Amino acid sequence: LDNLLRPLLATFSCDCVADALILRVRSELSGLPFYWNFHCMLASPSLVSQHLIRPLMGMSLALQCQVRELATLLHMKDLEIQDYQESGATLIRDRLKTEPFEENSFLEQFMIEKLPEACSIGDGKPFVMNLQDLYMAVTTQ
Amino acid sequence: MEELEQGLLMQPWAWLQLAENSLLAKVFITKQGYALLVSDLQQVWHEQVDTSVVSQRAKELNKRLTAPPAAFLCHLDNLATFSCDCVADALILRVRSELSGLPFYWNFHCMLASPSLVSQHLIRPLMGMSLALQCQVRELATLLHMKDLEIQDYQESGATLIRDRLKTEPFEENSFLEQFMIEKLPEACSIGDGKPFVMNLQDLYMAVTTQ
Amino acid sequence: MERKISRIHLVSEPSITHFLQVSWEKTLESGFVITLTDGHSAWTGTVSESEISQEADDMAMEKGKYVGELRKALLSGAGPADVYTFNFSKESCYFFFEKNLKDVSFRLGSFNLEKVENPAEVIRELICYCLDTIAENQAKNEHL
């Protein structure tokens, strides 16, 4: 079961009976076909808090701190290009001039233009690819 | 009442100072009734109420202190002393307020929220917020990379720095995570009492729910 | 002992000026006697220590603070912010009074009055005390 699931995280099927989810495995071991059913109840509010709500909230806070630290980083790069143009008495190839960063306008452009797809839950797919190394870290912490 | 639920999905979370702990609460009030979702960051509780329940429960809690339902609701919209018990899983939330120069009582009869609303009001929004915040990190990291291409053009031809304290190191995202994870993550991911959540994330909460 | 006459309008009776007389032993809180009149008829009743306590407990307020509200309501101690409201059936003799805020009235208390059998006589007393009280504050003034 472990060696079957590790690469994938054979065939599977998913059936609900009242509150309970059954996950079915058709595969093979020793050339012979192998069958399993997982029998899952609804997770308790403890588990959902510990595995989902709390870590997901702790990730959003830490990511908000990332955005803050990247905004102070951005402004510190803007003081630096200013110090070149304004007093460091020089120019560039022009094709690379960036706009001065302001997090108010960064957020308003982000939230008109990019939010519709960015917060897409979808298949949960992109959460497992983009966010897990943060998830493991937040849970440890 | 369907519009009360729809308002609720898109209301932000407030933070409540009990004597006993704190709570997080999102509420939507109209003249029609209210809907409320509460959490202590371990559990979640729900109530929805129309004006029929308002004038009955207010006449019980406040025997002779008459009003139309909508005037009570209007005052709760102002939002006092909070206490609670979990009795079974009624988080009964007991609220003492001042209105008309009279003490007032409301008790919220909050049952364990359904897993479906926990999904719609927390998990899915909170996920959607983490993905959106990560796209913001991604766009600040492209913006930081773009400003380095710009500043490297200066470093490539003439253009010395004057103020000997304006230097930026070249932005690199893996190492910015590495330092954050040791120096910043302990504090920043701490749930605490949920005041950090209500203080800085409610705009994104409101946006992601409306998306 | 203290008494205090106060002039009011019942909600029932826009154009009749009524008079409320209250009479007690410095704490209103100890209980008091209360008269209403309109210059033709009079009504009376009494309120006690445990009844004021009970009324304040039903309204969840510190007694003394609720007594504050009572002084302000019954002894003309109202500020400009305070708007009190006075209601009486002579028919049932049920008095009640209220405060107005939040664009609503809020009952502060209620009395069983009894119509008084000797109307013109308690009126006589009442207005003699007034003639005295005007004359005192007059003689005090001349002196000042």
What does this structure look like?
The PDB classes it as dna binding protein/dna. Keywords: nhej, DNA binding protein, DNA BINDING PROTEIN-DNA complex. The entry is titled "NHEJ Long-range synaptic complex". The structure is cut from a larger assembly and holds two copies of chain A and one copy of chain C (144 residues). In chain A, strand 1 (11-17) and strand 2 (20-29) form a beta hairpin. Chain A has five helices and three strands. In chain A, strands 1-2-3 form a three-stranded antiparallel β-sheet, with no helix packed on it. With 141 residues, chain A is α+β, with helices and mostly antiparallel strands. The two termini of chain A are 30 Å apart. Helix content of chain A is 57%, strand content 18%. Chain C has three helices and eight strands, in the order ββββααββββα. Chain C is globular, with a radius of gyration of 16 Å. In chain C, strand 5 (84-88) and strand 6 form a beta hairpin. A five-stranded antiparallel β-sheet of chain C has the order 1-2-3-4-8. In chain C, strands 5-6-7 form a three-stranded antiparallel β-sheet, with helices on one face. Chain C has 144 residues and is of the alpha+beta class. Chains A and B meet through helix 2, helix 3, helix 4 and helix 5 of A and helix 4, helix 5, helix 6, helix 7 and helix 8 of B.
Notable characteristics:
part of a larger assembly; 3 chains; A: 141 residues; alpha+beta; three-stranded antiparallel beta sheet; 18% strand; elongated; C: 144 residues; globular; dna binding protein/dna
Using DSSP, what is the number of strands of chain A? 3
* Biggest sheet: strand arrangement of chain A: 1-2-3
Number of strands of chain C: 8
Order of helices and strands of chain C: EEEEHHEEEEH
> How many helices of chain C does DSSP assign?
3
Q: What is the tally of helical segments of chain A?
A: 5
Subunit arrangement of the protein: part of a larger assembly
Helix content estimate of chain C: 25-40%
Specify the overall morphology of chain A. Answer: elongated
The helix content of chain A is 55-70%
Structural class of chain C: alpha+beta
Report the sheet with the most strands of chain A, covering strand number, pairing sense and barrel closure.
Answer: 3 strands, antiparallel
PDB class: dna binding protein/dna
Keywords: nhej, DNA binding protein, DNA BINDING PROTEIN-DNA complex
Entry title: NHEJ Long-range synaptic complex
Chains A, B: Non-homologous end-joining factor 1
